[PDB]
Amino acid sequence: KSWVEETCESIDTPECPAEFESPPTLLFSLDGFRAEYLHTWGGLLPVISKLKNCGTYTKNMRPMYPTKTFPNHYSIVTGLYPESHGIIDNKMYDPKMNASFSLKSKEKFNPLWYKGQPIWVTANHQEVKSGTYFWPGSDVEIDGILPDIYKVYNGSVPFEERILAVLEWLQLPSHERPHFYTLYLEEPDSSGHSHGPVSSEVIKALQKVDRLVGMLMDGLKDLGLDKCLNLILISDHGMEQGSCKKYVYLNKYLGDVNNVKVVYGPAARLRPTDVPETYYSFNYEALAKNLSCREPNQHFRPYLKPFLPKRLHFAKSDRIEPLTFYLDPQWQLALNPSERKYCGSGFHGSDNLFSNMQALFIGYGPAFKHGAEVDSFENIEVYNLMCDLLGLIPAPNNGSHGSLNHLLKKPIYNPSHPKEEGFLSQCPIKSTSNDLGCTCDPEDDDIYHMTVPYGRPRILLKQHRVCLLQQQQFLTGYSLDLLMPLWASYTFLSNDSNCLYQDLRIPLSPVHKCSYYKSNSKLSYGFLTPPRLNHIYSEALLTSNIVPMYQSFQVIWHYLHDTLLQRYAHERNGINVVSGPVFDFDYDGRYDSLEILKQNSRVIRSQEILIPTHFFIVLTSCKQLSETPLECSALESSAYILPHRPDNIESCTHGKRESSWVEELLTLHRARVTDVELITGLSFYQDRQESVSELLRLKTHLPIFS
Numbered sequence: 001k002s003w004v005e006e007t008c009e010s011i012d013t014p015e016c017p018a019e020f021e022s023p024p025t026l027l028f029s030l031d032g033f034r035a036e037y038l039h040t041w042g043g044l045l046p047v048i049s050k051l052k053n054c055g056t057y058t059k060n061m062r063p064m065y066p067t068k069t070f071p072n073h074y075s076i077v078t079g080l081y082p083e084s085h086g087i088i089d090n091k092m093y094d095p096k097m098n099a100s101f102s103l104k105s106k107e108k109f110n111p112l113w114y115k116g117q118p119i120w121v122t123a124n125h126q127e128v129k130s131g132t133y134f135w136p137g138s139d140v141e142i143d144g145i146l147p148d149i150y151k152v153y154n155g156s157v158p159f160e161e162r163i164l165a166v167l168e169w170l171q172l173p174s175h176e177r178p179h180f181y182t183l184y185l186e187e188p189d190s191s192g193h194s195h196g197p198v199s200s201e202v203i204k205a206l207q208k209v210d211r212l213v214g215m216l217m218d219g220l221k222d223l224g225l226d227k228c229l230n231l232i233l234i235s236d237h238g239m240e241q242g243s244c245k246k247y248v249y250l251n252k253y254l255g256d257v258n259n260v261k262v263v264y265g266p267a268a269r270l271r272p273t274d275v276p277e278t279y280y281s282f283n284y285e286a287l288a289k290n291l292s293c294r295e296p297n298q299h300f301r302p303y304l305k306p307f308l309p310k311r312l313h314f315a316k317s318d319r320i321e322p323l324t325f326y327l328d329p330q331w332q333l334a335l336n337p338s339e340r341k342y343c344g345s346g347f348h349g350s351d352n353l354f355s356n357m358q359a360l361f362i363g364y365g366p367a368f369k370h371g372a373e374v375d376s377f378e379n380i381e382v383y384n385l386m387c388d389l390l391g392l393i394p395a396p397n398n399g400s401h402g403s404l405n406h407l408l409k410k411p412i413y414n415p416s417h418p419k420e421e422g423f424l425s426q427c428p429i430k431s432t433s434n435d436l437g438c439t440c441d442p443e444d445d446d447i448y449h450m451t452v453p454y455g456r457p458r459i460l461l462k463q464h465r466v467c468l469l470q471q472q473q474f475l476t477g478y479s480l481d482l483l484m485p486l487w488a489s490y491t492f493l494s495n496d497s498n499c500l501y502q503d504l505r506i507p508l509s510p511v512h513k514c515s516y517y518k519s520n521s522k523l524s525y526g527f528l529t530p531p532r533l534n535h536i537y538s539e540a541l542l543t544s545n546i547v548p549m550y551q552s553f554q555v556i557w558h559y560l561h562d563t564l565l566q567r568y569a570h571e572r573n574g575i576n577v578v579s580g581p582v583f584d585f586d587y588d589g590r591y592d593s594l595e596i597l598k599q600n601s602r603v604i605r606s607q608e609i610l611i612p613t614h615f616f617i618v619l620t621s622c623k624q625l626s627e628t629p630l631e632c633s634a635l636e637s638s639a640y641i642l643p644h645r646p647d648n649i650e651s652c653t654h655g656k657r658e659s660s661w662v663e664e665l666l667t668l669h670r671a672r673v674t675d676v677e678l679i680t681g682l683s684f685y686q687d688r689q690e691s692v693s694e695l696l697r698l699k700t701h702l703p704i705f706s
């Protein structure tokens with residue numbers, strides 16, 4: 001009986017043959033295996049389905065941006081964002097090197113492109129042999145290290161020969177036998193491109209890849225290793241059906257120009273022709289503004305590199321062009337119709353939150369649970385997972401180590417909460433009482449636990465001075481070094497102007513007085529905590545609850561609290577809200593140091609002001625609608641990092657449908673709670689009853705579009 005014909009068998013304890021001390025780990029990749037494939041064509045894939053039913057499976061695995069082979073395949077083995085490991089796209093360019101990158105090119109084998117530290121390099125430093133087969137970055141030597149057994153990429157090599165090659169390596173002597181293995185197949189990406197996600201060719205491809213995996217499992221069985229191997233069946237990205245009618249050509253707005261170069265695709269980037277002579281000299285801002293809101297329902301959008309949604313983490317790299325394009329699903333962008341390969345073929349590279357861009361993940365073996373289905377997770381989390389499977393100390397990556405513990409029978413690493421590095425001090429009443437120049441028209445522990453029911457946010461800032469200011473409706477973490485609130489937490493239940501009051505607990509600043517704010521200047525102040533809470537709550541009009549805010553953002557901020565927030569309280573039976581300013585001028589996704597904060601502190605209206613680049617807001621509710629946010633058994637989190645812009649060009653307000661463009665902006669700039677943590681230096685939910693690993697799972701979560 002073949003392996004696919006046999007039923008499920010619990011591998012609680014690894015049954016390894018002699019000469020094996022511990023189960024090896026094989027990374028089997030199926031390029032272009034969209035997540036919807038297994039959802040829909042499960043009855044046609046008996047081998048893949050059994051690995052799913054007897055292993056650890058996830059409906060959707062979220063890949064990196066852009067959704068391309070090389071960036072994702074390299075992000076898997078490095079656990080790094082594409083902006084950090086160097087491989088931004090299949091085709092890219094480095095200005096500082098004056099060299100282009102391509103799959104079919106000599107620059108591909110240049111070690112100056114590959115940053116970070118892949119798993120095979122990590123394994124080598126800790127005396128662990130590795131045998132790879134056609135994995136991106138295996139041909140090139142990183143840090144002067146090459147896998148003990150490698151093969152320079154040759155797509156002409158038959159798949160059946162690739163499997164046998166790995167099977168031959170598994171038989172090597174105990175001292176010369178690799179402990180980590182990789183496998184790569186071009187299917188069903190190849191068939192996906194030429195005929196589309198919904199075709200007879202992909203079905204034939206899926207069945208082909210399915211039988212090929214069955215051959216591997218039969219091969220493992222004949223070697224007596226079917227219950228002694230950890231298998232991770234993964235993919236790089238999904239597949240979307242392209243159309244000729246749904247394509248964007250830049251020439252229609254620019255003309256047959258030759259001063260700009262466009263890397264075509266659903267994730268388009270733009271660089272000048274005179275490069276690197278005018279790589280920085282070229283002002284992209286004008287071109288971006290000249291391309292925005294040209295169509296009534298435009299399916300593309302010009303984005304300056306720091307203005308992209310933070311969830312993508314696609315700014316802090318030299319190779320990424322300062323001008324990018326975000327496109328709607330099923331849409332690609334190019335300069336001229338000649339540059340593009342084809343318009344009506346299957347493509348990928350779209351937003352990583354799109355339904356069809358989702359990838360595959362199946363963990364099978366003694367280390368993985370049997371028939372366990374978990375929630376979605378990013379591919380950068382797999383790096384740490386493999387380190388635990390190979391007994392390796394992971395290199396510094398972007399994955400939350402320990403967040404995938406629920407996949408393993410016996411988890412190896414037990415994570416802990418980050419210690420508070422902040423210098424927590426107290427702010428008593430000391431300075432009474434200045435004139436604010438404002439016109440106003442006519443015990444403690446119980447209120448604490450009510451405002452921060454999951455625990456106060458911890459200050460990961462080193463070594464920032466923070467005070468805890470308690471009110472009757474909210475608790476705010478105030479900064480003494482920046483003289484403004486870092487965060488404000490409050491609970492909003494299902495059903496419950498030019499005037500201000502001086503907070504005697506904080507030092508007075510010239511920007512706290514209303515006389516500072518005129519009706520002419522676009523810059524004003526906004527509240528972190530809505531004043532219409534619970535008559536009218538007056539402590540929300542405290543000076544310590546205001547932050548510098550553009551008038552254009554107030555359009556979004558008011559609708560967020562006056563309309564959406566109240567609706568969410570009815571739908572989710574109340575919400576706990578934590579809000580605050582975000583300062584990331586270096587667009588790296590992490591909080592700025594005191595040094596760079598002072599460099600970006602503008603002066604306006606004769607006063608020095610540090611204005612936020614973004615504003616974060618985290619919404620927390622109960623998974624059980626019968627419970628209020630003060631009595632959650634399990635949490636329901638959703639975070640947002642909203643861009644603080646002087647205007648609303650990104651939204652195309654023109655037509656004046658306020659209720660439409662705002663919600664679309666919120667959903668677009670949704671982010672992981674971890675993303676908010678990383679960019680603000682705060683830690684949430686530390687006093688929550690669930691374990692750290694569970695809380696990591698919660699904070700690293702993102703909803704899939706469509």
Ligand SMILES: *[C@@H]1O[C@H](CO)[C@@H](O[C@@H]2O[C@H](CO)[C@@H](O[C@@H]3O[C@H](CO[C@H]4O[C@H](CO)[C@@H](O)[C@H](O[C@H]5O[C@H](CO)[C@@H](O)[C@H](O)[C@@H]5O)[C@@H]4O)[C@@H](O)[C@H](O[C@H]4O[C@H](CO)[C@@H](O)[C@H](O)[C@@H]4O)[C@@H]3O)[C@H](O)[C@H]2NC(C)=O)[C@H](O)[C@H]1NC(C)=O
Pocket residue numbers: 080081084085116313396397398588589590593678
């Ligand atoms: C995802 O995960 C990845 C990996 O963890 C994260 O990527 C890492 O980000 C950090 C923070 O940005 C990076 O650290 C910085 O490294 C830079 C560059 O290093 C080089 O910089 C100069 C080259 O021109 C040079 O000055 C440096 O030379 C020495 O510098 C000091 C001297 O004592 C020494 O410590 C170094 O070892 C070098 O010998 C160096 O060649 C560096 O410029 C940054 O310095 C900042 O911080 C230091 C204090 O540590 C401070 O003194 C400086 O003033 C400055 O503020 C900083 O060290 C790191 O390189 C990244 N790692 C990888 C592998 O990419 C990424 O942040 C994560 N992303 C997200 C979204 O979380």
Ligand SMILES: Nc1ncnc2c1ncn2[C@@H]1O[C@H](COP(=O)(O)O)[C@@H](O)[C@H]1O
Pocket residue numbers: 031032067068069070090103104134135136137153155186189
């Ligand atoms: N290691 C590699 N080196 C060069 N090309 C590769 C490698 N792996 C896959 N490819 C090619 O990349 C293409 C698929 O990439 P993608 O279109 O982004 O899904 C196919 O043409 C593959 O043959």
Ligand SMILES: *[C@@H]1O[C@H](CO)[C@@H](O)[C@H](O)[C@H]1NC(C)=O
Pocket residue numbers: 098099275276
């Ligand atoms: C940049 O690269 C191009 C193409 O190889 C080359 O023609 C040019 O000389 C290079 N410029 C510099 C500054 O070296």
Ligand SMILES: *[C@@H]1O[C@H](CO)[C@@H](O)[C@H](O)[C@H]1NC(C)=O
Pocket residue numbers: 154155156157158
């Ligand atoms: C690629 O692999 C095929 C099949 O083994 C082989 O015939 C061919 O020689 C290889 N190409 C190169 C460039 O070596």
Ligand SMILES: [Ca+2]
Pocket residue numbers: 583584585586587588589590591592593
């Ligand atoms: Ca920063």
Ligand SMILES: [Zn+2]
Pocket residue numbers: 031032068069070189236237
């Ligand atoms: Zn691919």
Ligand SMILES: [Zn+2]
Pocket residue numbers: 032069189190193348
């Ligand atoms: Zn492809």
